[PDB]
Amino acid sequence: AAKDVKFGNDARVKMLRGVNVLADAVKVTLGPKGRNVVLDKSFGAPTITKDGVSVAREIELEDKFENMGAQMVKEVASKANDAAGDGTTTATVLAQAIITEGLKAVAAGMNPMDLKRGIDKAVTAAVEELKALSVPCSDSKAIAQVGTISANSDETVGKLIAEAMDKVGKEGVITVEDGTGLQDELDVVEGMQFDRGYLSPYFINKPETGAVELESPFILLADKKISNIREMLPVLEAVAKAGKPLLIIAEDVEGEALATLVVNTMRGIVKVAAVKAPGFGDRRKAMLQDIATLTGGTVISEEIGMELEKATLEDLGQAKRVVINKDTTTIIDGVGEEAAIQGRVAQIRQQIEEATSDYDREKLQERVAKLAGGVAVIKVGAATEVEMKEKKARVEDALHATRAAVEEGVVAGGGVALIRVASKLADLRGQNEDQNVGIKVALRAMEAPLRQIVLNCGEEPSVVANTVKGGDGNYGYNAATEEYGNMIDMGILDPTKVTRSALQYAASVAGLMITTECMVTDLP
Amino acid sequence: AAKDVKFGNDARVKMLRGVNVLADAVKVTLGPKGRNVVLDKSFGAPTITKDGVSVAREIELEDKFENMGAQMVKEVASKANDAAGDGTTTATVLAQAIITEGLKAVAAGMNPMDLKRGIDKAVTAAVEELKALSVPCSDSKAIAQVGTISANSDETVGKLIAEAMDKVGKEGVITVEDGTGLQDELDVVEGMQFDRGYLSPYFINKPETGAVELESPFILLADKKISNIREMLPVLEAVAKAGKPLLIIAEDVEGEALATLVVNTMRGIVKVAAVKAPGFGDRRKAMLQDIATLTGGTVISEEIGMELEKATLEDLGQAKRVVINKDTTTIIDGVGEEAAIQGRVAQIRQQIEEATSDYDREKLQERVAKLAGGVAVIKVGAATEVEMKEKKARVEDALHATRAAVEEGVVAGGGVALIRVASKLADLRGQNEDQNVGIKVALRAMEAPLRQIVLNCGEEPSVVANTVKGGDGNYGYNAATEEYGNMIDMGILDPTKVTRSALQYAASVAGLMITTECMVTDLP
Amino acid sequence: AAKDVKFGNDARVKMLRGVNVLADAVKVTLGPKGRNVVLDKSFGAPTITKDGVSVAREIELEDKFENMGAQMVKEVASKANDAAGDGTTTATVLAQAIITEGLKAVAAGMNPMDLKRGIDKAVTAAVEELKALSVPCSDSKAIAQVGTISANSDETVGKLIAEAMDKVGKEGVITVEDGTGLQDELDVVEGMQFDRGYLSPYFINKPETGAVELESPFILLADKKISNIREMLPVLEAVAKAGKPLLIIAEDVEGEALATLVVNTMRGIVKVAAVKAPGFGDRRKAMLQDIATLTGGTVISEEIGMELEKATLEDLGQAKRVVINKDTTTIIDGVGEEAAIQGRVAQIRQQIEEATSDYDREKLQERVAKLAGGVAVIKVGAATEVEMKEKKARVEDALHATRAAVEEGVVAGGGVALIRVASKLADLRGQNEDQNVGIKVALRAMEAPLRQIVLNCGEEPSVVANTVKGGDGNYGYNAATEEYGNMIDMGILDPTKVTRSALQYAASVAGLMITTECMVTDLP
Numbered sequence A, B, C: 001a002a003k004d005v006k007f008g009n010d011a012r013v014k015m016l017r018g019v020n021v022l023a024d025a026v027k028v029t030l031g032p033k034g035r036n037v038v039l040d041k042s043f044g045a046p047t048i049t050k051d052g053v054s055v056a057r058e059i060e061l062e063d064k065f066e067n068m069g070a071q072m073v074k075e076v077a078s079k080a081n082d083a084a085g086d087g088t089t090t091a092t093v094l095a096q097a098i099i100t101e102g103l104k105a106v107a108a109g110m111n112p113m114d115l116k117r118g119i120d121k122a123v124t125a126a127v128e129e130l131k132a133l134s135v136p137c138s139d140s141k142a143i144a145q146v147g148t149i150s151a152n153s154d155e156t157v158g159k160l161i162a163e164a165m166d167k168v169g170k171e172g173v174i175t176v177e178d179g180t181g182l183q184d185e186l187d188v189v190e191g192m193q194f195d196r197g198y199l200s201p202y203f204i205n206k207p208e209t210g211a212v213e214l215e216s217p218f219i220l221l222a223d224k225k226i227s228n229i230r231e232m233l234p235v236l237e238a239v240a241k242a243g244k245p246l247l248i249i250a251e252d253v254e255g256e257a258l259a260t261l262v263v264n265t266m267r268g269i270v271k272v273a274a275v276k277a278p279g280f281g282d283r284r285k286a287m288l289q290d291i292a293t294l295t296g297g298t299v300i301s302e303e304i305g306m307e308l309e310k311a312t313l314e315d316l317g318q319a320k321r322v323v324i325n326k327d328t329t330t331i332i333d334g335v336g337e338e339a340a341i342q343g344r345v346a347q348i349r350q351q352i353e354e355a356t357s358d359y360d361r362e363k364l365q366e367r368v369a370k371l372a373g374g375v376a377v378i379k380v381g382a383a384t385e386v387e388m389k390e391k392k393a394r395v396e397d398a399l400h401a402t403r404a405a406v407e408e409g410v411v412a413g414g415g416v417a418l419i420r421v422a423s424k425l426a427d428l429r430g431q432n433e434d435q436n437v438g439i440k441v442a443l444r445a446m447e448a449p450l451r452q453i454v455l456n457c458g459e460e461p462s463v464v465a466n467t468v469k470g471g472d473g474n475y476g477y478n479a480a481t482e483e484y485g486n487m488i489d490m491g492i493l494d495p496t497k498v499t500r501s502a503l504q505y506a507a508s509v510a511g512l513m514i515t516t517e518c519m520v521t522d523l524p
């Protein structure tokens, strides 16, 4: 089809318009006094959000040029959320400021490519200064403060998140979800707990709970479908002679074998709980070997060279307690070597490092968390459901900030460390005065976050930012409190990863955003 | 698609317009003198209702922003009906009042999120004051009065409701349904009566009713398909020797054994009634175990490890009387261990507490009702159908309010206890003057329900509400009578649960409603 | 979708407009001088009708709100036809008058629900007065008069209807159909006559009519398929030895068996007429048992414990005469126990009592009428097809009125007994002046039927109704004769059921029609 092309300043005007629209929509939610953006939903009820990339990803314009400029500027918030999951509004504001200043420099009749070169130089130096200005955040206090700041000044959320990684450990998994009531809560799970309920309620030794519990159980790890008691005659006779409970973690147990086993349960012969092997296929064998490592047993497999009729007490993994309910089979203290546990989680972490999909690395990380540490779950509560969504989003922003602050540390919060960094780079010069103008573009843009945070509080971002710049280090502006002081002190803490990724993506977008000369869309 | 985005006071104006439209439609039905609304039906004749959430759920606007604002405000009535099933119009009125006052506060150029914090603080205190002001409603008189008030001043409805729980007991089930004549009706059923008619009319011992009746029956509980009489030669010989009637509650009886048994019936060998096991699968096993508990029998199964040919008189459950008609089989006074019934319904109640779906907990509650107490049914009568719908809806609203009043007690009805509670909180102050103004928003909005109830009666809500506030406690306005006095005494009873849930949901919506800054919807 | 909402007096005006349109279309057919309405048929020629509910059910309005009110007011005529099948125009007129007067009362600013309460009170009293004013219509004279008035002053129709129940008896069934020529026809059928012609023409003992007739027939009631003579060797040998004609009422007789039987018919061995068992399944067994009761025979079925090869003369039911033609098999005077006939029809009437569908009770009443009484048919003859339609509908209205008058009696015709009833209620007062005004609304609306009937006759409904009210009892206005005088004596009779149901449904609709405040409908 015939295309629609804008050359020269017109293309830049469309770009600035789209970028400004998207950034104006995003930035109203920045800072502790940022407000919420109500998003209509064609299906169901509208949502209420204060997240930056959430607002950014919903922005499209009817003007094709402005729309696709907004499409290119949405990448800043999208990638900032992708990296750190927080500070997306700061990324959008910084990108818009860099783009505007660089376009103004282009409007002076000078090379945009050297503007991009200088912008990249200055922002690289600024990211370095942010990383060097990083102060570690590994104490649950500062972690809770970081989560607070990214939960829109919510101390309870950051506190609960710090308690969550405290309960689960560093190698454990922390999850934020909804609770049923109006209040949030945290639960941590240690050892193995896999959602494989008993394959028959007749195994239930505690009908008041509808659950099976086995003590010092024999965990027959069968990477096979358990069918005929003739397969289990040697092993189940050996277990009845042993008398201790046997736990079935296999592909399944058939109806006739299940009938024999259940009958024997109230015949008193064998106290067996039949459940399935967690995972499916490769992950099924992964869980099977995981349980074997925890319980010191062997996975009954056929291609390796043994049979179920060859299985005896030794092939049976051994645990201390295995609680089976209608859904979960919790191997509590699998009686087996820890050494195979660390070796398994080591191969698992090697897989994580070789896992490109976040899904793969996360599944393997959860394999570690079950096998090595624990699993913690945060439930969040609210009376209504828009409150549910907003509070859960804030709690997960807090989670992202807490983890990133554990990762890289923190800096002076509220866009103040960026002001310090910009003060640290007022001297940088590129290859030509054009690259120097690009550096000045970046430097002028670096003070936008605090100014926008303060503007969301309704002060003078000019006067307030000036007073903040008057002090240095962590001296800033407590935007929620409307005061100046050490941003680290009162707990205005932002992860260095958050700000660094935001700045990097903002500059990387703005560098090519400035150098646009020919812009083509389709005809409307 | 290109979106339609709004900022500033325009967003709040659109929110307020949609919310006001929805609440104005809702509140014409509040109070004893509330009027009805005809809802047109594209299919069939239009309907007439005085319910609040029913009117609320039908409201949508052509204006996208106002329409979706109505979408978020409809949540108040929807959730109030979900929790309490009554007082939904009061919830809508309270939500609209809080929203309007908080938006007015925002219009003063002041912080909305602190308004939300103060509103939540004041409303939590108000819910506490309401619950502390709860007076118990467990006697049939106060139940009748609650049903009266929530059936639009209909004493017959609340009376029938109190009589219903009196007949069925508290663990029993009460249902409001349609009657054929011009009048309401109440029926209670004891024991199990399960809709499993005789599998053959030749079993009918009373053809004048076309029904089978067995006395001291042998209840063969066989969770298996009867396939040949050869399966029943042990039990049928044992019963012909016993001579007492045998009742079959099995999976089914095949046609050949059915023919043999029917022949034996007029051959006089065994007095047979063949019916099926109520439920299907797991619920079928549940019903079979229930019948076994009451009748002192055992469900014939093969996984447990025994055959029907192995069954004898003992495996046949025993009752006092079992009446089988073309549809139902009523095990009247199953002669068997009650203790197993209470243990069974205890496991059933454990399931109820572990039943998240209302369907699951309700099925298990009915299992309790049949096994422990009884089952009650309320009918309703009318000449035409719009009358039928309006009356039955009033009866069910009254049922919901009576049960909520049994649960949490009652308070001063007609928007009066809310006035007392608001008077109890005139002092509360939040974190800042912003939260204080939010608390005052909540306090000012708390008194709206009396105003709307009085206005639906056509008085001066100002002067009448002032006179109501002049007295306290249960002194208020008898809106139907258009007089002042004790709300509790004059039969003006509203459940504390109803008002508490209404207030909670109204405030929880209004809190984020106030903090709205931007709207994003599709372009029209 | 975006809704169209009407509040207050706009909604009331739209309701009244729809009601008025529907009632104006209906009432032109009221009285002996009601005028006919051509209803266009998109397929075929339009019809000409003087029926009230027939005109009412065709009313559709483009205005959603007027159409809404019209749909709610159509219920009056629909339910009046549903209950009594007659006097539907009177129901529509009464409902319109009550609605108009109640809307006028509400337009005075007074409480609508109390108006509904008073209207219901007054109409309940009026229905009681109508029932107390009922004078029996059981003799053929008053039946003919009721039919005449409800056949729009057609004595032939009511006469034929009285003759119809005279020929068929009260337990019998009267049916009105159209005839072939220009004259109506009445036919009565007694005993058994089921449309099961001979299975083969070689059974025909009278080729001049193509019919089979058996004298003292042996009725083989086989609830089974009859296949091979080897099944019938005992039966047919027993018949040939008995020499009596053998009538087979079974599922069928197979082609080889039929060929052998037909051969034997002109071989002189057995005079067999093979016909099928009337009904299908349960109703087939019901017909078989009815014939067994009438003919003193036994139904051959396997599940009781006998076989066709076990059948002999005793299992062969016995009749006096069975006339079989190409279609029907008429067991005329089945010689057998009448006691089982009355017991069976008593069970069938029991089934009527727990028959929910009108089809169920109709089937069962026809079973009784065949087995106990008779069956009657009324034809409708005329030169053309529109005359078919009009005459048949008129005759069936007359039939409905005659039966309802046999049921509850009659009252003064032409809306005069209603005038007397309203004169008997001029004092009723409700709980408040609002209920009193509702009662007065009902009383004022009560005189509408006579006034509209007279207006259809072209007199002064004012002066005429005033003169009617001046006299009392049966003194009224002979609308057809344009004269005053006794309604009962000169043959103006209407069922008390018709008027009572009409008034009840009119008030039941109008009660909620008055109290509505608001409308909800889709946008046009």
Ligand SMILES: Nc1ncnc2c1ncn2[C@@H]1O[C@H](COP(=O)(O)OP(=O)(O)OP(=O)(O)O)[C@@H](O)[C@H]1O
Residues within 6 Å of the ligand: A029, A030, A031, A032, A034, A050, A051, A052, A053, A085, A086, A087, A088, A089, A090, A149, A150, A151, A152, A153, A397, A413, A414, A415, A449, A453, A477, A478, A479, A480, A481, A492, A493, A494
């Ligand atoms: N009490 C406070 N005083 C000063 N600055 C604060 C305060 N609380 C938060 N901030 C700053 O404001 C921002 C927090 O706002 P918000 O959490 O809504 O957005 P974000 O962290 O930039 O992005 P995201 O939408 O991805 O979570 C951060 O830049 C933080 O440093």
Ligand SMILES: Nc1ncnc2c1ncn2[C@@H]1O[C@H](COP(=O)(O)OP(=O)(O)OP(=O)(O)O)[C@@H](O)[C@H]1O
Residues within 6 Å of the ligand: B029, B030, B031, B032, B034, B050, B051, B052, B053, B085, B086, B087, B088, B089, B090, B149, B150, B151, B152, B153, B397, B413, B414, B415, B449, B453, B477, B478, B479, B480, B481, B492, B493, B494
């Ligand atoms: N006779 C009365 N005197 C005073 N207040 C009354 C009287 N009857 C009802 N009320 C009050 O008016 C309201 C009853 O109105 P209505 O029953 O139509 O709606 P609701 O209870 O708010 O909600 P729902 O539509 O869910 O049933 C309640 O707030 C009740 O306390």
Ligand SMILES: Nc1ncnc2c1ncn2[C@@H]1O[C@H](COP(=O)(O)OP(=O)(O)OP(=O)(O)O)[C@@H](O)[C@H]1O
Residues within 6 Å of the ligand: C029, C030, C031, C032, C034, C050, C051, C052, C053, C085, C086, C087, C088, C089, C090, C091, C149, C150, C151, C152, C153, C397, C412, C413, C414, C415, C449, C453, C477, C478, C479, C480, C481, C492, C493, C494
């Ligand atoms: N000769 C008459 N004198 C007085 N009133 C009469 C006379 N004939 C009929 N009526 C009255 O007119 C009505 C009968 O007319 P018509 O059969 O057309 O209407 P309907 O009975 O209301 O309607 P439908 O049979 O369609 O339900 C009755 O109210 C009857 O009392």
Ligand SMILES: [K+]
Residues within 6 Å of the ligand: A029, A030, A031, A034, A050, A051, A052, A089
């Ligand atoms: K944000």
Ligand SMILES: [K+]
Residues within 6 Å of the ligand: B029, B030, B031, B034, B050, B051, B052, B089
């Ligand atoms: K209401």
Ligand SMILES: [K+]
Residues within 6 Å of the ligand: C029, C030, C031, C034, C050, C051, C052, C088, C089
């Ligand atoms: K008519």
Ligand SMILES: [Mg+2]
Residues within 6 Å of the ligand: A086, A087, A149, A150, A151, A152, A397, A401
């Ligand atoms: Mg944040």
Ligand SMILES: [Mg+2]
Residues within 6 Å of the ligand: B086, B087, B149, B150, B151, B397, B401
């Ligand atoms: Mg109510």
Ligand SMILES: [Mg+2]
Residues within 6 Å of the ligand: C086, C087, C149, C150, C151, C397, C398, C401
């Ligand atoms: Mg008639």
